[PDB]
Each structure stands twice: as structure tokens, then as C-alpha cells.
mmCIF file of C-alpha atoms and ligand atoms in Angstrom:
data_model
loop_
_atom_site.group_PDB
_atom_site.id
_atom_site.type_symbol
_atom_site.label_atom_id
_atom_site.label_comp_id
_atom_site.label_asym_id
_atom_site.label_seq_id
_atom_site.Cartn_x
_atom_site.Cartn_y
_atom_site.Cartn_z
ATOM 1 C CA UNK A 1 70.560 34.533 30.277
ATOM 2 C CA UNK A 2 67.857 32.208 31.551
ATOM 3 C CA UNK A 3 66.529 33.520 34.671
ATOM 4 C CA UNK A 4 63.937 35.301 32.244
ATOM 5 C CA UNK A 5 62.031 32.407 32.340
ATOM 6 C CA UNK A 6 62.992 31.419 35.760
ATOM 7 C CA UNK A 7 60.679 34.828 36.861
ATOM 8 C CA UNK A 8 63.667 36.394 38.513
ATOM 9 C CA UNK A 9 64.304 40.206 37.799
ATOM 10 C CA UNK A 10 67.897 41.713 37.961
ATOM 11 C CA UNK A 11 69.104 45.229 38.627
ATOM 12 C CA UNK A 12 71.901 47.648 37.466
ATOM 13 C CA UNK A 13 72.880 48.777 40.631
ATOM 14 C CA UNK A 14 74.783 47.538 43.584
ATOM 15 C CA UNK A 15 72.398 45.241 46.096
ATOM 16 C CA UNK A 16 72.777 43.274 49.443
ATOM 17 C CA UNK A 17 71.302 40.326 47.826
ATOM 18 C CA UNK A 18 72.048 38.896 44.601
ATOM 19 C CA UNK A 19 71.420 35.671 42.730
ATOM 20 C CA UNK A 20 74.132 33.167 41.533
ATOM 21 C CA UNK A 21 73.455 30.843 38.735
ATOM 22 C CA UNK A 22 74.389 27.602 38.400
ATOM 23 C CA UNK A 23 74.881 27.844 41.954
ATOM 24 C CA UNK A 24 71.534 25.999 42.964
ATOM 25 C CA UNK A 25 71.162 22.636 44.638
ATOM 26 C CA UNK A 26 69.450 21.645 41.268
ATOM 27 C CA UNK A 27 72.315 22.053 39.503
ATOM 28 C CA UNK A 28 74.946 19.791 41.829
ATOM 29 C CA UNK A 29 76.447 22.547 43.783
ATOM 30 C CA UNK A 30 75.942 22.086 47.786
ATOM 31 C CA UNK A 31 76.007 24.396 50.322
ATOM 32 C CA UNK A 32 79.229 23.134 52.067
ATOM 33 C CA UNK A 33 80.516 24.264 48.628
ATOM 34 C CA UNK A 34 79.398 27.374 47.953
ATOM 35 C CA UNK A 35 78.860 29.555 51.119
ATOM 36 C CA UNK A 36 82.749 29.043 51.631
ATOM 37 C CA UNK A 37 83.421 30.408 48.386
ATOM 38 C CA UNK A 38 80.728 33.233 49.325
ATOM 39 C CA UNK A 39 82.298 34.305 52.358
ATOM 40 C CA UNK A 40 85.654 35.081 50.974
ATOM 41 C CA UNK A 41 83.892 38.549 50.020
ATOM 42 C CA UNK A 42 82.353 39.137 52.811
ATOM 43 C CA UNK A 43 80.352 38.382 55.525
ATOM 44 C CA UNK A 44 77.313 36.162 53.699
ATOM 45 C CA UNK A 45 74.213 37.321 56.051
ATOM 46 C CA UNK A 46 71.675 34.585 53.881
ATOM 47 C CA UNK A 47 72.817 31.656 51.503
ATOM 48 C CA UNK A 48 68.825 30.887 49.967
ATOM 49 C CA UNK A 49 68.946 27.868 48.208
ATOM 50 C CA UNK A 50 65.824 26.874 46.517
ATOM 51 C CA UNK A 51 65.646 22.989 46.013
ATOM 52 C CA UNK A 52 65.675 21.416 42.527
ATOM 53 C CA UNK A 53 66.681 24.978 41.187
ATOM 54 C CA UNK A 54 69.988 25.376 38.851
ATOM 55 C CA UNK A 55 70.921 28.606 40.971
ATOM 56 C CA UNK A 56 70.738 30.575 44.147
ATOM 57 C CA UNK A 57 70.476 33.568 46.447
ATOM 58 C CA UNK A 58 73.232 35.375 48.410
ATOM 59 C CA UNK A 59 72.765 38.093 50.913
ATOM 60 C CA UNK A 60 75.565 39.817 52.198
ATOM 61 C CA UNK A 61 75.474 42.016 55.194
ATOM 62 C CA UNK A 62 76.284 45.305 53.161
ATOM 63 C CA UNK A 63 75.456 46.227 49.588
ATOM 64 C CA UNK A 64 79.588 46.911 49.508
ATOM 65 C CA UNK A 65 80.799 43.130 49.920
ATOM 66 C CA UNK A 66 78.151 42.441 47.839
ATOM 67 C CA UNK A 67 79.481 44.292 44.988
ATOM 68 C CA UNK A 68 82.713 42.706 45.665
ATOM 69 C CA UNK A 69 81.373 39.438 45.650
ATOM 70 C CA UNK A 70 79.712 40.544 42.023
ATOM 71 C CA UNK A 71 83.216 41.603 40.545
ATOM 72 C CA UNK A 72 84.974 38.822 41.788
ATOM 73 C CA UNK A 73 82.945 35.816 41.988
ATOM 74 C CA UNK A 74 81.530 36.514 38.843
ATOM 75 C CA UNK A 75 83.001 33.749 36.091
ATOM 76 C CA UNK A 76 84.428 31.521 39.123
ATOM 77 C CA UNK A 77 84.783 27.560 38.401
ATOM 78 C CA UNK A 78 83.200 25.268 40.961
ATOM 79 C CA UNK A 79 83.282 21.418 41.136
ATOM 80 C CA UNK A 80 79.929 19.655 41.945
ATOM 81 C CA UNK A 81 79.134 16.587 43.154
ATOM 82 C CA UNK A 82 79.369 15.414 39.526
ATOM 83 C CA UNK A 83 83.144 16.302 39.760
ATOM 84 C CA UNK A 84 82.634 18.532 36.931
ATOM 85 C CA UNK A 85 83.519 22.347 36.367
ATOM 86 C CA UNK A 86 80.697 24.584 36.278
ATOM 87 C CA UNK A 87 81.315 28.321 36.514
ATOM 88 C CA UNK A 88 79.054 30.969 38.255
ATOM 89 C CA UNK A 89 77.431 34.107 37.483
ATOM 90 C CA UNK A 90 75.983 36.893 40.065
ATOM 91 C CA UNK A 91 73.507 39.669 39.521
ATOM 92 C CA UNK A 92 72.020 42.144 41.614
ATOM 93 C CA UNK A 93 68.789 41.258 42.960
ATOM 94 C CA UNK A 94 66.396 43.455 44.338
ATOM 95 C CA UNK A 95 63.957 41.275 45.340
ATOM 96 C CA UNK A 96 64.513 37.332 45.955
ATOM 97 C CA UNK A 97 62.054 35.691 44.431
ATOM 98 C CA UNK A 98 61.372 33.011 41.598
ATOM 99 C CA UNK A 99 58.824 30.450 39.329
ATOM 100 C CA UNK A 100 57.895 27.198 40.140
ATOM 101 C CA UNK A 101 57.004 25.628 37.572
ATOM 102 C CA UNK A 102 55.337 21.827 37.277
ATOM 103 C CA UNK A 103 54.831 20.339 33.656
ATOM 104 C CA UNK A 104 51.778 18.140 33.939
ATOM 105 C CA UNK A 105 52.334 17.402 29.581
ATOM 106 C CA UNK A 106 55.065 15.756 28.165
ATOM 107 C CA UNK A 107 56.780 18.029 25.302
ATOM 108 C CA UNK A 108 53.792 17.404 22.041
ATOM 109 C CA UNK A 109 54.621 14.759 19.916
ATOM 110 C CA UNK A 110 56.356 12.444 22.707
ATOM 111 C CA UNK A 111 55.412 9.251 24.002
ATOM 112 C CA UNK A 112 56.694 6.431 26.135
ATOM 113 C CA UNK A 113 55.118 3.016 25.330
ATOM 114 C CA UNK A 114 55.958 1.055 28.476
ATOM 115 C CA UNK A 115 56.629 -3.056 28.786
ATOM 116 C CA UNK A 116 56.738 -2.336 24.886
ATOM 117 C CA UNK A 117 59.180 -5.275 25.052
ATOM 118 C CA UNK A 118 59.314 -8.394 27.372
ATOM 119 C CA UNK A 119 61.965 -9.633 29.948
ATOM 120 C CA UNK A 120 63.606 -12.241 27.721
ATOM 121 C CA UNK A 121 63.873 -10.110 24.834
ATOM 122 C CA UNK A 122 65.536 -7.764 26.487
ATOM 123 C CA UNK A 123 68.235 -9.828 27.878
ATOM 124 C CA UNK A 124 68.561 -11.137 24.232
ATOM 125 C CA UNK A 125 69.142 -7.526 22.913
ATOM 126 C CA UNK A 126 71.600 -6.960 25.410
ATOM 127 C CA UNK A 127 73.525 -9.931 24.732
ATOM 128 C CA UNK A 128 73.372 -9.669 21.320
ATOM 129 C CA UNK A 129 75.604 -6.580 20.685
ATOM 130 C CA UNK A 130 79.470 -6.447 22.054
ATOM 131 C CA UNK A 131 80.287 6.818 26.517
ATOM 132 C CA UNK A 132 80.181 3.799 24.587
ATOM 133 C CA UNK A 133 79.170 4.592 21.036
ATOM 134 C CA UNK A 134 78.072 2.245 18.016
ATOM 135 C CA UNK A 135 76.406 3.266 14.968
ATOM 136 C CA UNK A 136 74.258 1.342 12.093
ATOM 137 C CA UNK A 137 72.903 2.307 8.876
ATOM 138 C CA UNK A 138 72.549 -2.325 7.802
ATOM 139 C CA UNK A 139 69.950 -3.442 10.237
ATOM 140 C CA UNK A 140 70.620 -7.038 11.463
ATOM 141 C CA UNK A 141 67.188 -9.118 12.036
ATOM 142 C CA UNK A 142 68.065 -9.370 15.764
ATOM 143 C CA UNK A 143 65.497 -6.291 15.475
ATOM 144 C CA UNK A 144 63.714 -6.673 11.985
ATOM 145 C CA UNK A 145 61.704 -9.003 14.053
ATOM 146 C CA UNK A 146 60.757 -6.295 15.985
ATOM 147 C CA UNK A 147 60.571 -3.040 14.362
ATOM 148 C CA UNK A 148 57.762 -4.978 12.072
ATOM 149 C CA UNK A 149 55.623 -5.499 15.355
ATOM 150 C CA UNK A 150 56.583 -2.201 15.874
ATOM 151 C CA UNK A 151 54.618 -1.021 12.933
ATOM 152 C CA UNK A 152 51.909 -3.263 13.181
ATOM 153 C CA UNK A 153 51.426 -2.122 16.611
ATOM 154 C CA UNK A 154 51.075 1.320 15.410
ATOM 155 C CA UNK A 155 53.814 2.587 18.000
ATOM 156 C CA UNK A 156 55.565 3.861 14.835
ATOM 157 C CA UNK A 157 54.547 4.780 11.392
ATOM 158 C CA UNK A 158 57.898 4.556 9.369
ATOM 159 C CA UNK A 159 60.694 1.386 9.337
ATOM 160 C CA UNK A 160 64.068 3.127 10.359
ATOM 161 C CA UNK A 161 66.970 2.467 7.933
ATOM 162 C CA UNK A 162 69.514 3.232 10.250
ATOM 163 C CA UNK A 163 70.154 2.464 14.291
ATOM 164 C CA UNK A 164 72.223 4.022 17.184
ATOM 165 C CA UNK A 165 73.317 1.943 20.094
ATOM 166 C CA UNK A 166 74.255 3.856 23.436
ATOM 167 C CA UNK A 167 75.424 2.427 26.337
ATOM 168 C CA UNK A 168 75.806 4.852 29.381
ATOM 169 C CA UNK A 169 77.517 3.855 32.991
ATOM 170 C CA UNK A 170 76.133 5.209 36.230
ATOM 171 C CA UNK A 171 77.502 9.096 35.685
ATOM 172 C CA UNK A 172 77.992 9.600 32.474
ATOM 173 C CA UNK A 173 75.378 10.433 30.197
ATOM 174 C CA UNK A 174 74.705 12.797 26.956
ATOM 175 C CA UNK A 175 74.850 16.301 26.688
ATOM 176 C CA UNK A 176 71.187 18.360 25.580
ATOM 177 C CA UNK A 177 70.810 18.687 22.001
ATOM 178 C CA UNK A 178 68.371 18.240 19.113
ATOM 179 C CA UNK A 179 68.642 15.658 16.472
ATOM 180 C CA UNK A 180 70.002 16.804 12.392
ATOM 181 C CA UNK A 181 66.830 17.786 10.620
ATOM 182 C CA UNK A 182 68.166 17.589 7.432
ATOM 183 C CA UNK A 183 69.871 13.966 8.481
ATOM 184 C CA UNK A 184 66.160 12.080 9.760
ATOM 185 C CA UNK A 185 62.580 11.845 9.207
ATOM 186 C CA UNK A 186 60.030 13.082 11.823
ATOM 187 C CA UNK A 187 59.999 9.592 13.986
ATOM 188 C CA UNK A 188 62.560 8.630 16.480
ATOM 189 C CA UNK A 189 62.376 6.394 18.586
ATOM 190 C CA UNK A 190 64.255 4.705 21.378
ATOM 191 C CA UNK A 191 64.314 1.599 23.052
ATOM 192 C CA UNK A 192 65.722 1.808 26.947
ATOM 193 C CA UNK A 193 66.749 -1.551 28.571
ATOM 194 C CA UNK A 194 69.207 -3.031 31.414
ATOM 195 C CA UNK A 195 68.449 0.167 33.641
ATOM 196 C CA UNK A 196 65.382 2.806 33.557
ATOM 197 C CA UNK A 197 67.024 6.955 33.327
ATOM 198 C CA UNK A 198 65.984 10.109 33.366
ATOM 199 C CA UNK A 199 65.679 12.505 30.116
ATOM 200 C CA UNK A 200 65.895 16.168 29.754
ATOM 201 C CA UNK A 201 63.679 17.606 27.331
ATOM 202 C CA UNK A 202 63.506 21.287 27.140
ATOM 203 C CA UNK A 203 61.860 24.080 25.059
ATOM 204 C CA UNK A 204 63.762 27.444 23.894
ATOM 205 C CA UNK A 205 60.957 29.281 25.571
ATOM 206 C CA UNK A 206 62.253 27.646 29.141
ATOM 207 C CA UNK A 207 59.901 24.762 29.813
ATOM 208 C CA UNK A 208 61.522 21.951 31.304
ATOM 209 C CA UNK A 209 60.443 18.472 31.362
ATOM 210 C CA UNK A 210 62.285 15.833 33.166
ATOM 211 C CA UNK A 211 61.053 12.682 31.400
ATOM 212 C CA UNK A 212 61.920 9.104 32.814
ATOM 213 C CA UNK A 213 62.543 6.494 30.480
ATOM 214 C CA UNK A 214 62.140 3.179 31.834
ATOM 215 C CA UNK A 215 63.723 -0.280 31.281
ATOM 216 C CA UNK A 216 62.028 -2.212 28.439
ATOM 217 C CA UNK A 217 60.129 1.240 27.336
ATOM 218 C CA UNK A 218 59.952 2.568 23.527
ATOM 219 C CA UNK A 219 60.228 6.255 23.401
ATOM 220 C CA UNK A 220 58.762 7.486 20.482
ATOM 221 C CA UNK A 221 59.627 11.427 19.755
ATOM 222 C CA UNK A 222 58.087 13.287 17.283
ATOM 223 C CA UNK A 223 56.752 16.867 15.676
ATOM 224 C CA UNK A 224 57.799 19.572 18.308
ATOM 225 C CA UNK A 225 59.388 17.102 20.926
ATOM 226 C CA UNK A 226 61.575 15.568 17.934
ATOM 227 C CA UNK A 227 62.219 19.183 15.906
ATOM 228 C CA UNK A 228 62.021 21.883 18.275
ATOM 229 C CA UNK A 229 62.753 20.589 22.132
ATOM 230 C CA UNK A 230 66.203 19.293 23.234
ATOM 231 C CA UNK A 231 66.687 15.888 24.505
ATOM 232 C CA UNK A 232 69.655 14.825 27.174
ATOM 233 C CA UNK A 233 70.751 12.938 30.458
ATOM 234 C CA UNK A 234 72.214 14.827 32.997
ATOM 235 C CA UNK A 235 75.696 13.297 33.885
ATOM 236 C CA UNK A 236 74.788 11.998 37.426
ATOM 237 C CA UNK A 237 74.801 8.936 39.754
ATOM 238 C CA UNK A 238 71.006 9.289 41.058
ATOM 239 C CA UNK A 239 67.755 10.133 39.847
ATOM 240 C CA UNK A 240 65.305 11.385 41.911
ATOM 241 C CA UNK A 241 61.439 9.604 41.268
ATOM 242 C CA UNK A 242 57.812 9.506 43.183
ATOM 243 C CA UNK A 243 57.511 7.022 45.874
ATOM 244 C CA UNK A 244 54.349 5.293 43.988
ATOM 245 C CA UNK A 245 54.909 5.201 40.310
ATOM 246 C CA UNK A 246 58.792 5.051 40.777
ATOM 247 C CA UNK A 247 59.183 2.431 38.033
ATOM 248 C CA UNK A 248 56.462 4.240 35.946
ATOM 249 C CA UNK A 249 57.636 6.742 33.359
ATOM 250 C CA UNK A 250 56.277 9.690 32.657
ATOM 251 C CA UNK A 251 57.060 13.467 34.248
ATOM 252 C CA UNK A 252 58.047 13.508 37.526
ATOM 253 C CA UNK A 253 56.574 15.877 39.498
ATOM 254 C CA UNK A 254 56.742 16.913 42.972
ATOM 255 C CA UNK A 255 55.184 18.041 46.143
ATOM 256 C CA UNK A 256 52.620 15.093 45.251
ATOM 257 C CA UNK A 257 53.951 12.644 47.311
ATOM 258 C CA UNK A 258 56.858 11.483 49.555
ATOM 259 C CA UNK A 259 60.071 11.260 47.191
ATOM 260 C CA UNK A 260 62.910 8.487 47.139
ATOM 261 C CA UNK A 261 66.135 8.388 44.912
ATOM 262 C CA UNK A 262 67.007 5.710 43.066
ATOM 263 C CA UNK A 263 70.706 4.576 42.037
ATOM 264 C CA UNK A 264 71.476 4.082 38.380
ATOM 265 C CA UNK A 265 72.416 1.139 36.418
ATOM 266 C CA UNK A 266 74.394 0.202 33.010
ATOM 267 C CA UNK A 267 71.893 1.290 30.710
ATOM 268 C CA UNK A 268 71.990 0.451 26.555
ATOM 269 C CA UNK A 269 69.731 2.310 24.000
ATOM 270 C CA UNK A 270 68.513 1.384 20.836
ATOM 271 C CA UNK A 271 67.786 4.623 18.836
ATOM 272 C CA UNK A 272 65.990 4.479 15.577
ATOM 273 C CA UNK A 273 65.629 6.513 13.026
ATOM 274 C CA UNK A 274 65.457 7.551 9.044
ATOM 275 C CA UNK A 275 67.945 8.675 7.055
ATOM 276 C CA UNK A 276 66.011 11.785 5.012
ATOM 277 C CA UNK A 277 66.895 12.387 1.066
ATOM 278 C CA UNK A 278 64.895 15.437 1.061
ATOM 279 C CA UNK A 279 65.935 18.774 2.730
ATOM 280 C CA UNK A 280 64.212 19.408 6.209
ATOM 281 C CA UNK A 281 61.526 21.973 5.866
ATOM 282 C CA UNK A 282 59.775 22.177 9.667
ATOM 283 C CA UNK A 283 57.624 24.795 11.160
ATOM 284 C CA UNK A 284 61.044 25.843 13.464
ATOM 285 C CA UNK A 285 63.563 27.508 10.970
ATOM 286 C CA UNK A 286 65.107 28.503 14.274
ATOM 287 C CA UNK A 287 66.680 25.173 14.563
ATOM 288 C CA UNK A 288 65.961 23.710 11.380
ATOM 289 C CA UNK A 289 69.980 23.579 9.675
ATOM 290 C CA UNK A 290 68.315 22.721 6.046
ATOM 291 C CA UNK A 291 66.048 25.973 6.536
ATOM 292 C CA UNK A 292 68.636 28.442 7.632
ATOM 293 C CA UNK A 293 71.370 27.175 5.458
ATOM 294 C CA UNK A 294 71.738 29.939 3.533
ATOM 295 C CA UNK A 295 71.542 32.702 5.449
ATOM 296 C CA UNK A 296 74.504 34.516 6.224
ATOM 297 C CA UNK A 297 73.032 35.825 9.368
ATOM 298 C CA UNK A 298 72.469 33.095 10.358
ATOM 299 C CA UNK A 299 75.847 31.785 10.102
ATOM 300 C CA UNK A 300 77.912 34.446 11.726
ATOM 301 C CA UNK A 301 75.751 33.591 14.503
ATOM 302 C CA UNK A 302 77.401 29.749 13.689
HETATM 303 O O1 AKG B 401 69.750 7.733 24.984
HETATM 304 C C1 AKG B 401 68.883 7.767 24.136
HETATM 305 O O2 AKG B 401 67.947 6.815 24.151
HETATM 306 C C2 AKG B 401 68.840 8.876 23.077
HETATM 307 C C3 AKG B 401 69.870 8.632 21.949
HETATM 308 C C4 AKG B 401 70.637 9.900 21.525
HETATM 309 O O3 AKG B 401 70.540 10.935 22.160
HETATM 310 C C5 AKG B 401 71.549 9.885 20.297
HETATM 311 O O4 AKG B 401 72.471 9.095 20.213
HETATM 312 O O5 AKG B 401 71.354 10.765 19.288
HETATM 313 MN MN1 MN B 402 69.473 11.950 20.029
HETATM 314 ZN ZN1 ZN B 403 63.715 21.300 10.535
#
């Protein structure tokens, strides 16, 4: 499913150890929660639970429970600290191991200008407006002002003709996806302001690249990180930064430093972007709706 990427190999046959996805610290599930479910099989000789990993391993005492645990467990709901349902899926293991795997570029074609706007006119913005949704598309001079600096600047190469506004509450956030092709030009950007987040941007192949957007900060997506990656916000109460450059955006990596959560805050986004006339015609037809339109392969596979 995704552990291809993840470097772990799977077996066929019955094993003492197995490894459950979606059951990883990195993906909201705890221990207290898990191992409990995990013992109702059998007894669970090893719960290995690699940290910041969406999965992981179970060793049972004999390769028997295990395969109970395997026919049983297999498809089970669990609620995470996000109070959310999340079901699980075992495979035999013969080996526990796995990839770590540290980004040190940001998905091409991305790019966070930082301070791009100043205190005061971000408290204007915010009070300026009244998952909270609201769509545009047109563009009141509150932001014409703007979006022409914008272009000067250089930040951005094309005037949008058409705005989202998102507002998201400590929790709740937006699910990973990849903006119409056929609906907007290749420039997107996105203003963050009232409280700095964390993005998800991830590539089919498996990279994953945790970006944080800061408050007052322009992200500008475009080519492959606008076409081909997948942007979202994992629906959580804390996001985890570097002690240093914790207001900084950028990737955050780890095992560079000494690492300190930070709570969230009622953050509103400005997304711009616009409309296209012409159909979409990318380098990434495996995404691209306009270039797989017609293709009735294509759509029995929706
Ligand atoms: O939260 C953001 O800044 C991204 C906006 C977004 O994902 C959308 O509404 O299409
Ligand atoms: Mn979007
Ligand atoms: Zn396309």
C-alpha cells in the first residue's frame, strides 16, 4: 500500500512479528491505545513503535497468535488522539525494519516568502472579512493594493482573478489533495496570518515534506509542487517545530536539535489563484483531469 516506500518488506506466510499501519505514533495512535487492542490475540512479546512514523511493529510470542492477530485485527477502527476513526492493517513481517527519510528541499516549484506582509496589515486583513469556507471570483481592493506589490515584487508573475478565504480552528484542518488543473493557472499562492501551521506536501513516489507556513508568510506553489504534489493540514491541536528557527518556515527536520511543540491558533488564509480558459496540458497526465479526460481507462479507475 505504502510501506513500499517506507523500505519495509512483507511476507506471505505466518510470522511472530508483523507490522500495523496506521498504527504508528506518527499517525495519532498511542501506545496505551494500541497494545490493549494487541493483546486481545495474544500475548504481545514487543509493541516497536518508531516515532514520527504512521505505523508500527507487533511481536507476538508465537507465530500462531500472530496469525490470529492478522485475521482479526486486520480492518479494525481505532480512535486517536484526534478523536477520529482510523482503521488498521497487519502484515507479516519477517524482518522489522524501515526508512528514515529527511527532506532537506522543499517539493520544486515551492516557496515561502516570509514577513511578506507587515503586522498592521495583517490585522487589517483579518478584520476586514466576516471549516469555515468563503469563496471569490470579484476581488475587493482590500487586496488589489497588494497583489500589485505582489507583482512588482516579483513574488508572483500572474494577477489572480479569483480568491479563497480559509479559516481553520485549532484541530480542524484540510484533507491532502491537489488543486483542478483544468480550473487554475500554474501560480498559487497563499497568504497565512493570525496563527503560523504546518502543511503536508507529498509526492506519489512517497516523499514527504512537512512544510510550515508561518503567520504573515506568502506561499507561492508552483510547477511540480502546484501540479503533481498534494498539499494538506493534518487535523491536529499541535505542531511539532525546531527549538531555534521555531517561528521560521521552511522543512522541519529532526535529530538537529532539541524539539518543542507549539499549540495552534485561529488561523485565516488567503488563497490566490487563476481561473484557466484553456484546457490543462502538464507534464503529469497522471493527475492532470483535462489530460486524462477521455480515457475510459482512466475513468473506470474514477
Ligand atoms: O490553507 C491554505 O493556505 C491552502 C488553501 C487550500 O487548500 C484550498 O482551499 O484549496
Ligand atoms: Mn488548495
Ligand atoms: Zn495538469
Amino acid at each position: 500500500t505504502l510501506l513500499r516506500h517506507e523500505g519495509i518488506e512483507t511476507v506471505s506466510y505466518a510470522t511472530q512479528s508483523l507490522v500495523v499501519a496506521n498504527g504508528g505514533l506518527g499517525n495519532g495512535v498511542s501506545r496505551n491505545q494500541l497494545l490493549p487492542v494487541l493483546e486481545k490475540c495474544g500475548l504481545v512479546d514487543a509493541l516497536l513503535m518508531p516515532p514520527n512514523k504512521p505505523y508500527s511493529f507487533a511481536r507476538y510470542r508465537t507465530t500462531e497468535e500472530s496469525k490470529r492477530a492478522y485475521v482479526t485485527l486486520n480492518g479494525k477502527e481505532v480512535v486517536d488522539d484526534l478523536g477520529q476513526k482510523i482503521t488498521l492493517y497487519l502484515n507479516f513481517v519477517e524482518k522489522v525494519q524501515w526508512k528514515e527519510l529527511r527532506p532537506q528541499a522543499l517539493p520544486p516549484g515551492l516557496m515561502v516568502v516570509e514577513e511578506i506582509i507587515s503586522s498592521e496589515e495583517e490585522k487589517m486583513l483579518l478584520e476586514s472579512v466576516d471549516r469555515r469556507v468563503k469563496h471569490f471570483g470579484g476581488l475587493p481592493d482590500i487586496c488589489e493594493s497588494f497583489l500589485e506589490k505582489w507583482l512588482r515584487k516579483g513574488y508572483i508573475k500572474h494577477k489572480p482573478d479569483q480568491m479563497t478565504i480559509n479559516q481553520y480552528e485549532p484541530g480542524q484542518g484540510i484533507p491532502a489533495h491537489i488543486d483542478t488543473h483544468s480550473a487554475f493557472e500554474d501560480e498559487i499562492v497563499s497568504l497565512s496570518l493570525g496563527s503560523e501551521i504546518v502543511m503536508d506536501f507529498k509526492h506519489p513516489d512517497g516523499i514527504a515534506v512537512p512544510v510550515m507556513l508561518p503567520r504573515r508568510s506568502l506561499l507561492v506553489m508552483t510547477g511540480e509542487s502546484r501540479y503533481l504534489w498534494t498539499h494538506g493540514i493534518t487535523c491536529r491541536k499541535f505542531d511539532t517545530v525546531q527549538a531555534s528557527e521555531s517561528l521560521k518556515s521552511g522543512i522541519i527536520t529532526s535529530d538537529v536539535g532539541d524539539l518543542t511543540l507549539s499549540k495552534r491558533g485561529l488561523r485565516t488564509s488567503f488563497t490566490f489563484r487563476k481561473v484557466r480558459q484553456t484546457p490543462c496540458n502538464c507534464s503529469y497526465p497522471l493527475v492532470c483531469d483535462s489530460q486524462r479526460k477521455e480515457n475510459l481507462y482512466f475513468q473506470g479507475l474514477e
